[PDB]
Amino acid sequence: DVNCWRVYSTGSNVFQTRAGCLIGAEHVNNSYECDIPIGAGICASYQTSQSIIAYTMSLGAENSVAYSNNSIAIPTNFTISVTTEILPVSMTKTSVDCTMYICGDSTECSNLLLQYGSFCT
Amino acid sequence: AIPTNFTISVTTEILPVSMTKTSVDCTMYICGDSTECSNLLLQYGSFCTQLNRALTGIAVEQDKNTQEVFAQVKQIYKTPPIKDFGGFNFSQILPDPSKPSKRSFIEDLLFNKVTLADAGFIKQYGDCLGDIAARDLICAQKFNGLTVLPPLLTDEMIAQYTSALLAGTITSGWTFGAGAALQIPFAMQMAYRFNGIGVTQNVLYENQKLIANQFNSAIGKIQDSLSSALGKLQDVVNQNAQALNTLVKQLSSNFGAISSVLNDILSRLDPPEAEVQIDRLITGRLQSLQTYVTQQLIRAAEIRASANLAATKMSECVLGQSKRVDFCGKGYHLMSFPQSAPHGVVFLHVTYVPAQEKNFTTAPAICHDGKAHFPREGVFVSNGTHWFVTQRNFYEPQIITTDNTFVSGNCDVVIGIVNNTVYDPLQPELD
Amino acid sequence: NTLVKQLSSNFGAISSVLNDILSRLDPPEAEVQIDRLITGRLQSLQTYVTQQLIRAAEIRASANLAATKMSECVLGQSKRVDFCGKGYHLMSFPQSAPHGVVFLHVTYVPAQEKNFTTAPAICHDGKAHFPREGVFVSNGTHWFVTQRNFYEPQIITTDNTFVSGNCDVVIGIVNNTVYDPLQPELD
Numbered sequence A: 001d002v003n004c005w006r007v008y009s010t011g012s013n014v015f016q017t018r019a020g021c022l023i024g025a026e027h028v029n030n031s032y033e034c035d036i037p038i039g040a041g042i043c044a045s046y047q048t049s050q051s052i053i054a055y056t057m058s059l060g061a062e063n064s065v066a067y068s069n070n071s072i073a074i075p076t077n078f079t080i081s082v083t084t085e086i087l088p089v090s091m092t093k094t095s096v097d098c099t100m101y102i103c104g105d106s107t108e109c110s111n112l113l114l115q116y117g118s119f120c121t
Numbered sequence B: 001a002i003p004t005n006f007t008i009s010v011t012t013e014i015l016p017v018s019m020t021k022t023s024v025d026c027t028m029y030i031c032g033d034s035t036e037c038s039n040l041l042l043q044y045g046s047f048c049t050q051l052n053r054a055l056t057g058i059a060v061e062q063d064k065n066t067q068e069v070f071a072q073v074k075q076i077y078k079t080p081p082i083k084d085f086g087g088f089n090f091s092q093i094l095p096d097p098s099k100p101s102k103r104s105f106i107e108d109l110l111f112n113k114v115t116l117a118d119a120g121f122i123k124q125y126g127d128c129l130g131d132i133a134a135r136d137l138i139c140a141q142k143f144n145g146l147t148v149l150p151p152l153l154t155d156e157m158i159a160q161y162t163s164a165l166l167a168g169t170i171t172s173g174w175t176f177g178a179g180a181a182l183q184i185p186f187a188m189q190m191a192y193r194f195n196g197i198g199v200t201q202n203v204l205y206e207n208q209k210l211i212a213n214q215f216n217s218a219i220g221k222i223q224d225s226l227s228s229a230l231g232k233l234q235d236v237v238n239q240n241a242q243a244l245n246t247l248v249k250q251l252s253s254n255f256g257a258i259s260s261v262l263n264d265i266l267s268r269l270d271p272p273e274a275e276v277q278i279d280r281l282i283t284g285r286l287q288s289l290q291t292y293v294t295q296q297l298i299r300a301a302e303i304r305a306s307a308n309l310a311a312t313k314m315s316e317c318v319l320g321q322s323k324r325v326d327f328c329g330k331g332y333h334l335m336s337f338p339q340s341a342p343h344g345v346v347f348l349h350v351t352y353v354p355a356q357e358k359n360f361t362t363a364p365a366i367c368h369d370g371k372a373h374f375p376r377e378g379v380f381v382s383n384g385t386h387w388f389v390t391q392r393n394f395y396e397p398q399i400i401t402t403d404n405t406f407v408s409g410n411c412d413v414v415i416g417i418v419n420n421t422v423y424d425p426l427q428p429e430l431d
Numbered sequence C: 001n002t003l004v005k006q007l008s009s010n011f012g013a014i015s016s017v018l019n020d021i022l023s024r025l026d027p028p029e030a031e032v033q034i035d036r037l038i039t040g041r042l043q044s045l046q047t048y049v050t051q052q053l054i055r056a057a058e059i060r061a062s063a064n065l066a067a068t069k070m071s072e073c074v075l076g077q078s079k080r081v082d083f084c085g086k087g088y089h090l091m092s093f094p095q096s097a098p099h100g101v102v103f104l105h106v107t108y109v110p111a112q113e114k115n116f117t118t119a120p121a122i123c124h125d126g127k128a129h130f131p132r133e134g135v136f137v138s139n140g141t142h143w144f145v146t147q148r149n150f151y152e153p154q155i156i157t158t159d160n161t162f163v164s165g166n167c168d169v170v171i172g173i174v175n176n177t178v179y180d181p182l183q184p185e186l187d
C-alpha cells in the first residue's frame, strides 16, 4: 500500500509494481518463467555477484500458423510416448481419547468433564 | 420421422474459476494498538499461525485453478492477417487491435457487467485520513488487519491465453491439442466435424453459404443479448465482500464484558480487573476469525470443483469434438470458443439442431430373391409408392443397390420384411 | 503435532498445567481455572475434527477421479481429449504408490509434417466426387487421396470416393480423372 515514505528502510533498487513498492530487487527487461510469484504478473528470482531480480513473467513461445485456403499438413512419422500421472487415494486414519487429552490422569478433571460427554461422542 | 433442414445454434455457459485472496493480521484485529492486549494475546499465538496457514493454502489454490483452466498450451499462436475462413466471420470474438486492452468485443461487454468491489490494490494511508475512514468500507477493513491480495495473472495475460486458444482452433482444428498445429482450410475442418455427428460432407459443401449465414446471425444474437446475465460471477464477489464486512461489524459485541471497546476498559480499570474483561473479548474475537476461516475453506472447495469442471470443458469442447450428450451444449456438438470473464470463463458452444421433420413408412429389411437385405449405414423409407434408403439425420433419398446394402439369410425370420427390387449396378455394364 | 503443542495454552487461567493448579488451590477455586482449560481444549479438538472433514472431502473427490481413470483408461480405450495423457490414447498401466496410484499412459503422437495443396472435391464428368474416409492432396503435379493422420498416398478410384451432384455448387472443386477400376477388366 505504498506508491514510491512508510517503509522500514529505503536502500536502493526501489521499483513500483501494481502489487506495491518493491525494495531490494533489481529490475530486468527480460521475461523468464515464474520462479517466485510476486503478483500482478511480476515474479522474482535469485540470479547472477548473486542478486534478487524482478521481472515480468513470460507466457510461452510465440509461433504463427501458415494458414491458406488450399493447404494442409499431414504427418509422415509417429512417436510413441509414455507419461505418468499421480493421484492421492487415501489419508491417515486417526482416533482420539478425549479424556486422555483434556484431563490426563486427574480424577477431579474427569468428574468435571462428565458434563461435556456428548461433545466427545 | 426424418429431418429435412437444420439449424446452427450458439449458446453460452458461465463458470466461476477463482475467488478473492485474503489475509488477516490477527493482532491488528483483536487488539488494535493496545500493548497490554498484545501481551495478553501472546498466550494464543498458535491459533493465529494456524488460521494464516489455512488462508495461504486457499490463496495459492486460486492461482493453481486459473493456471489449470487457461494455461494448457504454451505456444502463443497469432491469428493470420488474411481472414478467409469460407464466409465465417469471427471478428466479434477475435481481439480488437486498437483498444488498450487487447480484448475482443464480447470480452469487453462481459467485463462491464460484473462490478468488482474495489478496482486496484494500492490504497494509500494518506488517501483515507480522517473523515474518509469508517465511511469507505475498504479503509474500514484495512484499519482492522483485513487485506485482499492481487492475483498472479493479470486480465491482459488471460486475454492473451484465450486469443491463442482461439487462433489455434480456427487455423488447425483439433491437431494443436495433440501435438504440433497442422493447418487445414476452415471449411474442410467443418466438413470433418459434420462427419463426426453422422452427416456426410456433401451436405456441408452444398449448404456452405446457408451455414455461414446462420452462424453469423447467431453470433449477432449473442452480442445483442449481452448489451441489454452473469449472476454466477457476481455472487462470488458479493459473498467475499459480505464476509469481510460481517467481520468488521462483529467488533461491537461485548461477549459478556462491560464494553466492546478496549480503551474504555483500560481507563477506569486496573490491570488485574481489566484482564478478565480483556480475556472475554479475546476469546470472542478469536472465535469470529475461526468462523470466517472455516466458511472460506468450504467455499474454496466448491470453487475448486467448478474449476475442475471448467478445465475438463476446455479440454473436451474446445480442443476436440465431444460425443457425450449435453456436455458441450444442447444438440450435436460442433465446436466451442472460450472467452475470459472476471473470475471466470464463458463458453460459446456451436451445435447442430435438426429442423424440419417429415413422416415416412419404414421397414427393417428388403426381400428380393429369397434373400434379406439390410442397410449398411442408413434406413429404408417409403414416400408412399417407392422405396429408398437414406441417412438417419438428414433426408437424402437414394436407390437401393447392392453396393448400398448387405445380404444375410432368407426372408422367413425377420418380423416386418417387405418385398422390393435391388438394382445391382453391374448387369447393364456387362451387357 | 499442532494438537500436541496447543497443550501449553493458559486460555486465561493461572497456568496450563492441571497438577500445578490442583496443588495450591482448593476445589471451589480450582474449578473455575479447570473450567477455562476444559473449554479451551474442547475447542482445539473441535477445530482439528473440522479440518479433517474438509480434507477428507478433497481426498474423496480425488479417489473418485482415480476410479474413473481406472475404468476408462486401463479397462478400455478413451476418446475424450486429455483424460488419459497428451496425444491419442492407446493404453494405460497402473502402479500402486503409498497412499495413491500412478498411471503410465501410452499415447500416439504425430511426428513429421509435410505441406500439400488440397481440394474438397474432384470434377470428372460433370459429377462431384468426395472422399469416403480420407482427404484429397497434391504433391504439386499429381492428385491422390490419403488418410488424415498418416501419409499413405493412393490413386483416386470409384471404389475410393462417392458421387453427389454436379460441379456447379462446391466452392473449390478441381478437375481430375477417376480411374474406375473395372474398364480394363471388361476389355
Ligand SMILES: *[C@@H]1O[C@H](CO)[C@@H](O[C@@H]2O[C@H](CO)[C@@H](O)[C@H](O)[C@H]2NC(C)=O)[C@H](O)[C@H]1NC(C)=O
Binding pocket: A003, A004, A017, A018, B122
Ligand atoms: C503511483 O502514482 C503515480 C503518480 O501519480 C501514478 O502515475 C499516474 O497514473 C495515472 C493513472 O492513469 C496517470 O493518469 C498519470 O499520468 C500517471 N502519472 C505519472 C507521472 O506516471 C501511478 O498510477 C501510481 N501507481 C499505481 C500502481 O497505481
Ligand SMILES: *[C@@H]1O[C@H](CO)[C@@H](O[C@@H]2O[C@H](CO)[C@@H](O)[C@H](O)[C@H]2NC(C)=O)[C@H](O)[C@H]1NC(C)=O
Binding pocket: A077, A078, A079
Ligand atoms: C521414423 O522415426 C524413427 C524414429 O522415431 C526413425 O528411426 C530412426 O532412424 C534413424 C536414421 O534414419 C536411426 O539413426 C535411429 O536409430 C532410428 N530410431 C529407431 C528407434 O529405430 C525412422 O527412420 C523414421 N522413418 C521415416 C520414414 O522417417
Ligand SMILES: *[C@@H]1O[C@H](CO)[C@@H](O[C@@H]2O[C@H](CO)[C@@H](O)[C@H](O)[C@H]2NC(C)=O)[C@H](O)[C@H]1NC(C)=O
Binding pocket: B005, B006, B007, B210, B213, B214
Ligand atoms: C432451410 O432453412 C433455411 C433457414 O433456416 C431456409 O432459408 C430461408 O429461406 C427463406 C425462404 O425460403 C428466406 O426468406 C430466408 O431468408 C432464408 N434464410 C436464410 C438464412 O437464408 C432454407 O430455405 C431452408 N431450405 C429448405 C429446403 O427448406
Ligand SMILES: *[C@@H]1O[C@H](CO)[C@@H](O[C@@H]2O[C@H](CO)[C@@H](O)[C@H](O)[C@H]2NC(C)=O)[C@H](O)[C@H]1NC(C)=O
Binding pocket: B089, B091, B092
Ligand atoms: C464481420 O462482422 C463485422 C461486425 O459484425 C462487420 O463489420 C461491420 O460492418 C458494417 C457494415 O456492414 C459496419 O457498419 C460496422 O461498423 C462494422 N463493424 C465493425 C466493428 O467493424 C464486418 O463487415 C463483417 N465482415 C467482414 C468481412 O469483416
Ligand SMILES: *[C@@H]1O[C@H](CO)[C@@H](O[C@@H]2O[C@H](CO)[C@@H](O)[C@H](O)[C@H]2NC(C)=O)[C@H](O)[C@H]1NC(C)=O
Binding pocket: B383, B384, B385, B386
Ligand atoms: C415417390 O417418389 C417417386 C420416385 O421419385 C415419384 O415418382 C416420380 O414422380 C415424378 C413427378 O411426377 C416423375 O417425374 C418421376 O418420373 C417419377 N419417378 C418414377 C420412378 O415413377 C412419386 O411421385 C412419389 N410419390 C409420392 C406419393 O409422392
Ligand SMILES: *[C@@H]1O[C@H](CO)[C@@H](O[C@@H]2O[C@H](CO)[C@@H](O)[C@H](O)[C@H]2NC(C)=O)[C@H](O)[C@H]1NC(C)=O
Binding pocket: B367, B419
Ligand atoms: C413377397 O414375395 C413372396 C414370394 O416372392 C410372397 O410369398 C408368397 O406369397 C404368395 C401369395 O401371398 C403365397 O401363395 C406363397 O405361398 C408365398 N410363398 C412363396 C411363393 O414361397 C410374399 O407373400 C410376398 N409378400 C407380400 C406380397 O407382402
Ligand SMILES: *[C@@H]1O[C@H](CO)[C@@H](O[C@@H]2O[C@H](CO)[C@@H](O)[C@H](O)[C@H]2NC(C)=O)[C@H](O)[C@H]1NC(C)=O
Binding pocket: C139, C140, C141, C142
Ligand atoms: C508427384 O508424384 C508423381 C507420381 O508418383 C511423381 O511422378 C513419378 O515420378 C517418379 C520419379 O521420377 C517416376 O518414376 C514415376 O513414373 C512418376 N509417375 C508418373 C505417373 O509420372 C512426381 O515426380 C511427383 N512430383 C513432384 C513434384 O514431386
Ligand SMILES: *[C@@H]1O[C@H](CO)[C@@H](O[C@@H]2O[C@H](CO)[C@@H](O)[C@H](O)[C@H]2NC(C)=O)[C@H](O)[C@H]1NC(C)=O
Binding pocket: C123, C175
Ligand atoms: C474443368 O473442366 C470444365 C469442363 O470440363 C471447365 O469448364 C469450362 O471451361 C472452359 C474454359 O475455362 C469454358 O470456356 C467453358 O464454358 C467451361 N464450361 C463448360 C465447358 O461447361 C472448367 O473451367 C475446368 N476447370 C479448370 C480448368 O480449372
Ligand SMILES: *[C@@H]1O[C@H](CO)[C@@H](O)[C@H](O)[C@H]1NC(C)=O
Binding pocket: A028, A029
Ligand atoms: C529497459 O527498457 C527501457 C525502455 O525500453 C529502457 O529505458 C531501459 O534502460 C531498459 N533497461 C535495460 C537494463 O536495458
Ligand SMILES: *[C@@H]1O[C@H](CO)[C@@H](O)[C@H](O)[C@H]1NC(C)=O
Binding pocket: B357, B358, B359
Ligand atoms: C406425422 O404423422 C402424425 C400422425 O397423425 C402427425 O400427428 C404428425 O403431425 C406428422 N408429422 C409431420 C411432421 O407431418
Ligand SMILES: *[C@@H]1O[C@H](CO)[C@@H](O)[C@H](O)[C@H]1NC(C)=O
Binding pocket: B415, B416, B417
Ligand atoms: C405392425 O402392426 C400391424 C398391426 O397394426 C401388424 O399387422 C404388423 O405385422 C406389424 N409389423 C411389425 C413389423 O411388427
Ligand SMILES: *[C@@H]1O[C@H](CO)[C@@H](O)[C@H](O)[C@H]1NC(C)=O
Binding pocket: A066, C113, C114, C115
Ligand atoms: C509449410 O509451408 C509454410 C509456408 O511458408 C512454411 O512456413 C512451413 O514451414 C511449411 N511446413 C513444412 C513442414 O515444411
Ligand SMILES: *[C@@H]1O[C@H](CO)[C@@H](O)[C@H](O)[C@H]1NC(C)=O
Binding pocket: A069, A070, C171, C172, C173
Ligand atoms: C482461395 O483463395 C483464392 C485467392 O487467394 C481464391 O481465388 C480461391 O477461389 C480460394 N479458394 C476457395 C476454395 O475459396
